[PDB]
Every structure is written in structure tokens, then in C-alpha cells.
């Protein structure tokens, strides 16, 4: 059944559409169901004009961000204590289990390493993120991490800022 | 005769162009750190604490809006914008 519809000013119509499209809507039900039909077309005219403006401002603010260095030399690292966030990040510090080093500084975080951290009692993970790079006009390979599409570490000269802007504005 | 009284995309755009706790913590932190620490540790530590907290909440608010609609965007792309 099509359920209940809503009038333009928020409130719900005190009459249900108890029939489905196979049974055939009554004349009263068809008129009520036209309320949501009008909303869909009108909301389309604002979903595009707003997301398009949002995308342009998103790309504009980071258009100049390009991978220009292999390593800025930073020592800062965001502390992490979910899995999909940690994959592809570069460790900012060594990780130890007892007296054994299980993960080294400046090493890409695979999912096997992450599972090993979760399997044992590892509380703090220090990673290099865009927040830790020693620049706001460019980013380095290690602070960005693995390429979003090429699997390996990101390559020099990649316009990651425009890709970042397009990735957010696209589903708008 | 009688009167009764009874009980997305705009959200993400508002955050980008600028949480109730975030603005209440920034107000609280501003008036205290400078009074405790003087020469730049008053300003350096205060700015560091405010910016670190802002980045965490700015990414969380944007990610929460997109996750509510099933949109899957990596944290890297948002951290590029927030930076």
C-alpha cells in the first residue's frame, strides 16, 4: 500500500492510500498521491542548483592542492584507537608488541596489520593524515597515503584537491 | 469552536560555511588558557587545542550527514577540505 502522504506545509493528510498501484488508486487517493509527485519535481530543481553551487565552492577551495613532495619531514601523528579509515594511512611512529616491532614508521597500513592491531591489545595508532602535513598549499605522498584508485602510494603531481572536491560534491 | 495545541544537503553546506558543544568549548578554552599560560604557550597551545577539536568535529558532522544517506566518501577527501 502507498501508505500516507504529506501536505506541503509539513503536516500529514488524515487519509491513507490503502491501495497499491496494481489494485488501482481511487480518485481521492490519486489526488493525494499527487502531493508527493509535485514535491519530487520541485525538490529536483533545488537539489541541482544547490549541489552545483556547493561543488564549485568545494573544488575552488582545494584546487591548488597537488602532491608535490615525497615526504615533508613531519613528526606529528594523529592518534587513533573504523577499519576503512585506517587502511592506506602511513604510520607516523613505530608499533611494538612486547619487545617485537610489528609495524615500522613510514609504512603503509594494510588490513592485515590493522587486524593484528585489533587482535592484540594495541591502544594507540599514530598515522599521517592531511592534517599532519607541513603545508596548506600542497601535500606530500606520505601524508596523503595510498592512491584511491591505483592501489600503491599516491604519485607526485596528482591533483588530489580536485579529486577531493569532486568526490564530495558528486553525490550531492 | 475550540483550539488545540499538540506536538541533508542544507545541513552539510551549513557546516562547510560555518555543534553546540564545539562553540561552548571554544568559548570556555579561550578565556582560560591565556590566563594560565602567557608568552606564546598561551596562544600556541590555545590555538592548537581549538583547531584540533574543530577538525575532529567538523569531519564527524560532515561524515554523519553523508552516512545517514548511504553515501560512502573516504575520510581523506573531507580532511583535505577541512584542513
Amino acid at each position: 500500500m502507498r501508505g500516507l502522504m504529506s501536505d506541503p506545509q509539513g503536516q500529514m493528510i488524515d487519509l491513507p492510500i490503502q491501495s497499491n498501484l496494481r489494485e488501482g488508486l481511487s480518485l481521492t487517493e490519486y489526488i493525494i498521491s499527487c502531493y508527493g509527485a509535485r514535491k519530487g519535481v520541485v525538490d529536483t530543481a533545488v537539489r541541482t542548483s544547490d549541489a552545483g553551487y556547493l561543488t564549485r565552492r568545494l573544488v575552488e577551495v582545494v584546487q591548488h592542492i597537488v602532491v608535490r613532495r615525497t615526504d615533508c619531514g613531519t613528526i606529528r601523528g594523529i592518534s587513533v584507537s573504523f577499519i576503512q579509515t585506517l587502511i592506506g594511512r602511513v604510520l607516523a611512529d613505530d608499533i611494538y608488541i612486547g619487545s617485537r616491532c610489528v609495524a615500522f614508521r613510514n609504512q603503509d597500513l594494510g588490513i592485515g596489520l590493522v587486524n593484528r592491531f585489533i587482535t592484540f591489545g594495541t591502544q594507540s595508532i599514530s598515522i599521517r593524515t592531511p592534517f599532519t602535513c607541513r603545508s596548506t598549499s600542497w601535500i606530500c605522498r606520505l601524508c596523503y597515503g595510498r592512491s584511491p584508485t591505483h592501489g600503491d602510494l599516491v604519485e607526485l603531481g596528482e591533483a588530489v584537491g580536485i579529486i577531493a572536491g569532486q568526490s564530495i560534491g558528486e553525490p550531492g | 469552536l475550540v483550539t488545540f495545541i499538540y506536538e541533508g544537503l542544507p545541513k552539510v553546506e551549513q557546516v562547510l560555511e560555518v555543534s553546540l558543544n564545539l562553540e561552548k568549548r571554544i568559548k570556555g578554552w579561550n578565556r582560560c588558557i591565556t590566563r594560565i599560560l602567557g608568552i606564546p604557550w598561551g596562544f600556541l597551545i590555545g590555538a592548537e587545542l581549538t583547531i584540533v577539536q574543530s577538525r575532529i568535529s567538523l569531519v564527524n558532522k560532515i561524515q554523519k550527514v553523508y552516512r545517514s544517506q548511504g553515501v560512502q566518501i573516504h575520510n581523506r577527501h573531507i580532511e583535505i577540505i577541512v584542513r
Binding site: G77, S79, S124 | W29, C32, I36, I45, E48, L49, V52
Partner: peptide
Amino acid sequence: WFPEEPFEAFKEMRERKVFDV
């Protein structure tokens, strides 16, 4: 959330490695 107490906040950034002596 970093606690609103300035010294608790300082201890937090010490623990989260945001800032140290």
C-alpha cells in the same frame, strides 16, 4: 571531546600527542 577543564584538556593533548613539553 576534549574536556572543558583547561588542565584536563592539557592532559588530553598530552595523551593524544597533540602537544607535549
